[PDB]
Paper text:
FILIA is a member of a recently identified oocyte/embryo expressed family whose members are characterized by an atypical KH domain. The SCMC contains a core formed by FLOPED, MATER, TLE6, and FILIA. FILIA is important in regulation of mitotic kinase activity and spindle assembly checkpoint activation, and contributes to chromosome stability, although the molecular basis for the relationship between its special localization and its unique function is not clear. In order to study the structural basis for its function, we expressed and crystallized the N-terminal domain of FILIA ranging from 1 to 124 amino acids (named FILIA-N hereafter).
The crystal structure of FILIA-N (1–124 AA) was solved by the single wavelength anomalous diffraction (SAD) method. FILIA-N crystallized with two molecules in an asymmetric unit forming a stable dimer. From residues 40–118, FILIA-N forms a classical KH module with a β-α-α-β-β-α topology. The N-terminal 39 residues prior to the KH region form a unique substructure in FILIA-N. This substructure is composed of a loop at the beginning (residues 2-12), followed by two anti-parallel β-strands (β-1 and β0) and an α-helix (α0). The peptide from residues 2–12 is located in a groove formed by the β-1-β0-sheet and the β1-β2-β3 sheet, bridging the N-terminal extension and canonical KH region, thus contributing towards the stability of the whole molecule. The total buried area in the dimer of FILIA-N was approximately 1920 Å2 compared to 930 Å2 for the Nova2-KH3 dimer. On the dimerization surface, most of the interactions involve the helices α2 and α3. Hydrophobic interactions contribute most of the stabilizing forces, including residues Met68, Met101, Leu65, Leu69, and Leu105. A measured molecular mass of 29814 Da was obtained with a Kd of 10 nM, indicating a stable dimer with high affinity. Surprisingly, although the FILIA 40–124 (FILIA-NΔ39) protein lacking the N-terminal extension still possessed a KH domain, it completely lost the ability to bind RNA.
Author numbering:
A (entry chain A): 2 to 117
B (entry chain B): 3 to 114
């Protein structure tokens, strides 16, 4: 990616496109299976939404990950480029977590335009 | 955290499964009053509530918007179980029920 680094239970390196790698030797969550690292789902969001959706430095992401049983990885670049939220787990899960994050994004977008 | 927690649609908990919307709030597009006819209840130690949901439940409106489910928190003594009430349905192979008990589990552990 490029770096703002967001919090998560398992920090990953975004190597290239679909390739992610676990950084160092973290204690993994009981529900997390290394195999899920193979096919993550990506969804785009504008960058300014990231900290509204996930809190400052993505501080609420470990809670969300615990609730969803999917890893969340955030890649962010310039203000002019779309951010990428990458989601990791069983495909039956990645689909509905995808709708949840889209629904959350819709909400945060409305609040953004109201708080201004 | 308080005795009333935050939410998109503040409710009065009348008795058991019976709730009522307080006043005339603008409702979320995804929400319909008939949702209140499908409550599910979960129990939790009161101590976990502010860990799970933020001070005074300040994160609940985000959670509700993610889940498309209203969350009502009834709390009593620090002794007895708090009730979490949800008016669904779920967006995952995992019941909103299961996602919230799992959140509580994580928060129980992190509380050590």
């Amino acid at each position: 990616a490029s770096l703002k680094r967001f919090q998560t239970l398992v920090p990953l390196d975004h190597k290239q496109g679909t390739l992610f790698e676990i950084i160092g030797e973290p204690k993994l969550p009981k529900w997390f299976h290394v195999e899920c690292l193979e096919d993550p789902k990506r969804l785009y969001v504008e960058p300014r939404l990231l900290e509204i959706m996930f809190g400052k430095d993505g501080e609420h992401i470990p809670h969300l990950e615990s609730m969803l049983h999917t890893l969340i990885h955030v890649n962010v670049w310039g203000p002019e480029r779309r951010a990428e939220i990458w989601i990791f787990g069983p495909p039956p899960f990645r689909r509905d977590v995808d709708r949840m994050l889209t629904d959350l994004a819709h909400y945060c977008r409305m609040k953004l335009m109201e708080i201004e």
